Protein backbone atom coordinates (compact mmCIF):
# COMPACT_ATOMS: atom_id res chain seq x y z
CA UNK A 1 0.00 0.00 0.00
CA UNK A 2 1.02 3.62 -0.69
CA UNK A 3 0.15 7.07 0.68
CA UNK A 4 -1.86 9.22 -1.74
CA UNK A 5 -0.34 12.57 -2.89
CA UNK A 6 -1.08 15.30 -0.25
CA UNK A 7 -4.11 17.62 -0.77
CA UNK A 8 -3.69 20.44 -3.32
CA UNK A 9 -2.70 23.73 -1.69
CA UNK A 10 -2.23 26.14 -4.55
CA UNK A 11 -4.14 26.96 -7.69
CA UNK A 12 -3.17 30.20 -9.57
CA UNK A 13 -6.49 29.99 -11.52
CA UNK A 14 -8.44 30.55 -8.26
CA UNK A 15 -9.25 34.25 -7.52
CA UNK A 16 -7.37 35.67 -4.52
CA UNK A 17 -8.50 38.08 -1.84
CA UNK A 18 -7.18 39.03 1.55
CA UNK A 19 -9.82 39.45 4.25
CA UNK A 20 -9.60 40.08 8.01
CA UNK A 21 -11.29 36.66 8.56
CA UNK A 22 -8.71 34.77 6.44
CA UNK A 23 -5.85 36.76 8.13
CA UNK A 24 -7.29 35.79 11.55
CA UNK A 25 -7.50 32.10 10.52
CA UNK A 26 -3.75 32.09 9.63
CA UNK A 27 -2.24 34.46 12.24
CA UNK A 28 -4.48 33.43 15.15
CA UNK A 29 -6.32 30.06 14.56
CA UNK A 30 -3.64 28.09 12.64
CA UNK A 31 -0.77 29.61 14.73
CA UNK A 32 -2.51 28.79 18.09
CA UNK A 33 -3.43 25.21 17.10
CA UNK A 34 0.05 24.60 15.64
CA UNK A 35 1.64 25.46 19.04
CA UNK A 36 -0.78 23.23 21.07
CA UNK A 37 0.98 20.42 23.06
CA UNK A 38 -1.05 17.78 21.12
CA UNK A 39 -0.71 19.31 17.62
CA UNK A 40 2.27 17.38 16.15
CA UNK A 41 0.25 14.37 14.62
CA UNK A 42 -2.09 16.89 12.89
CA UNK A 43 0.79 19.00 11.41
CA UNK A 44 1.26 16.74 8.38
CA UNK A 45 -0.84 14.12 6.47
CA UNK A 46 -1.47 10.73 8.13
CA UNK A 47 1.56 8.62 7.10
CA UNK A 48 -0.26 5.32 6.52
CA UNK A 49 2.98 3.70 5.12
CA UNK A 50 5.16 4.61 8.17
CA UNK A 51 2.34 3.62 10.60
CA UNK A 52 1.39 0.47 8.59
CA UNK A 53 -2.31 1.44 8.36
CA UNK A 54 -3.33 -0.02 4.93
CA UNK A 55 -7.01 0.74 5.74
CA UNK A 56 -6.57 4.48 6.52
CA UNK A 57 -6.95 5.75 2.93
CA UNK A 58 -9.62 3.06 2.23
CA UNK A 59 -11.78 4.67 4.99
CA UNK A 60 -10.69 8.35 4.73
CA UNK A 61 -11.36 9.72 1.22
CA UNK A 62 -11.14 13.41 2.25
CA UNK A 63 -7.85 13.56 4.29
CA UNK A 64 -6.86 16.92 5.81
CA UNK A 65 -4.13 18.16 8.12
CA UNK A 66 -2.86 21.51 9.48
CA UNK A 67 0.22 21.58 7.22
CA UNK A 68 -2.18 21.59 4.24
CA UNK A 69 -4.43 24.28 5.88
CA UNK A 70 -1.37 26.53 6.59
CA UNK A 71 -0.23 26.24 2.88
CA UNK A 72 -3.82 26.83 1.54
CA UNK A 73 -4.03 30.04 3.69
CA UNK A 74 -0.54 31.18 2.51
CA UNK A 75 -1.47 30.50 -1.11
CA UNK A 76 -4.83 32.38 -0.82
CA UNK A 77 -6.51 29.09 -1.80
CA UNK A 78 -9.69 29.96 0.14
CA UNK A 79 -12.03 32.75 -1.01
CA UNK A 80 -14.08 32.55 2.21
CA UNK A 81 -13.33 31.72 5.84
CA UNK A 82 -16.03 28.93 5.81
CA UNK A 83 -13.94 26.85 3.33
CA UNK A 84 -11.02 26.95 5.82
CA UNK A 85 -13.27 26.20 8.85
CA UNK A 86 -14.61 23.20 6.85
CA UNK A 87 -11.04 21.84 6.38
CA UNK A 88 -10.38 22.01 10.16
CA UNK A 89 -13.78 20.26 10.72
CA UNK A 90 -12.83 17.56 8.16
CA UNK A 91 -9.49 16.99 9.95
CA UNK A 92 -11.27 16.45 13.33
CA UNK A 93 -14.10 14.30 11.87
CA UNK A 94 -11.56 12.07 10.01
CA UNK A 95 -9.82 11.35 13.31
CA UNK A 96 -13.16 10.50 14.99
CA UNK A 97 -14.31 8.19 12.17
CA UNK A 98 -11.01 6.31 11.79
CA UNK A 99 -10.01 5.86 15.45
CA UNK A 100 -11.86 4.36 18.42
CA UNK A 101 -13.49 6.79 20.93
CA UNK A 102 -11.23 7.25 23.98
CA UNK A 103 -7.99 6.46 22.04
CA UNK A 104 -5.05 8.86 22.73
CA UNK A 105 -5.22 10.43 19.23
CA UNK A 106 -9.00 11.10 19.67
CA UNK A 107 -8.37 12.78 23.06
CA UNK A 108 -5.67 14.89 21.31
CA UNK A 109 -8.12 15.82 18.46
CA UNK A 110 -10.86 16.71 21.10
CA UNK A 111 -8.40 19.03 22.95
CA UNK A 112 -7.41 20.73 19.60
CA UNK A 113 -11.11 20.99 18.59
CA UNK A 114 -12.04 22.67 21.95
CA UNK A 115 -9.29 25.31 21.29
CA UNK A 116 -10.39 25.66 17.64
CA UNK A 117 -14.04 26.25 18.63
CA UNK A 118 -12.93 28.90 21.21
CA UNK A 119 -11.01 30.80 18.45
CA UNK A 120 -13.91 30.45 15.92
CA UNK A 121 -16.33 31.94 18.53
CA UNK A 122 -13.93 34.97 18.47
CA UNK A 123 -13.90 35.16 14.59
CA UNK A 124 -13.90 38.91 13.75
CA UNK A 125 -16.78 40.51 11.80
CA UNK A 126 -16.16 40.84 8.02
CA UNK A 127 -14.61 44.26 7.14
Ligand SMILES: Cc1noc(C)c1-c1cc(C(N)=O)c2c3ccc(C(C)(C)O)cc3n([C@H](c3ccccc3)C3CCOCC3)c2c1
Nearest residue numbers: 040041042043044045046047048051094095098099104105
Ligand atom coordinates in the same frame (compact mmCIF):
# COMPACT_ATOMS: atom_id res chain seq x y z
C1 LIG B 1 -3.94 12.79 13.27
C2 LIG B 1 -4.41 11.41 13.13
N1 LIG B 1 -5.69 11.02 12.95
O1 LIG B 1 -5.73 9.64 12.78
C3 LIG B 1 -4.44 9.17 12.86
C4 LIG B 1 -4.18 7.73 12.70
C5 LIG B 1 -3.59 10.24 13.08
C6 LIG B 1 -2.16 10.17 13.24
C7 LIG B 1 -1.35 10.82 12.29
C8 LIG B 1 0.04 10.66 12.35
C9 LIG B 1 0.82 11.20 11.21
N2 LIG B 1 0.63 12.53 10.91
O2 LIG B 1 1.56 10.49 10.53
C10 LIG B 1 0.61 9.89 13.39
C11 LIG B 1 1.96 9.51 13.77
C12 LIG B 1 3.24 9.80 13.25
C13 LIG B 1 4.37 9.24 13.86
C14 LIG B 1 4.28 8.38 14.97
C15 LIG B 1 5.55 7.75 15.58
C16 LIG B 1 6.22 6.89 14.52
C17 LIG B 1 6.49 8.84 16.08
O3 LIG B 1 5.19 6.92 16.69
C18 LIG B 1 3.00 8.07 15.52
C19 LIG B 1 1.85 8.65 14.91
N3 LIG B 1 0.49 8.49 15.26
C20 LIG B 1 -0.01 7.71 16.43
C21 LIG B 1 -1.04 6.66 15.97
C22 LIG B 1 -0.53 5.61 15.16
C23 LIG B 1 -1.39 4.62 14.65
C24 LIG B 1 -2.78 4.65 14.93
C25 LIG B 1 -3.30 5.68 15.74
C26 LIG B 1 -2.44 6.67 16.27
C27 LIG B 1 -0.49 8.64 17.55
C28 LIG B 1 0.49 9.80 17.79
C29 LIG B 1 0.02 10.63 18.95
O4 LIG B 1 -0.07 9.84 20.13
C30 LIG B 1 -1.06 8.83 19.98
C31 LIG B 1 -0.68 7.88 18.86
C32 LIG B 1 -0.27 9.25 14.34
C33 LIG B 1 -1.65 9.42 14.26
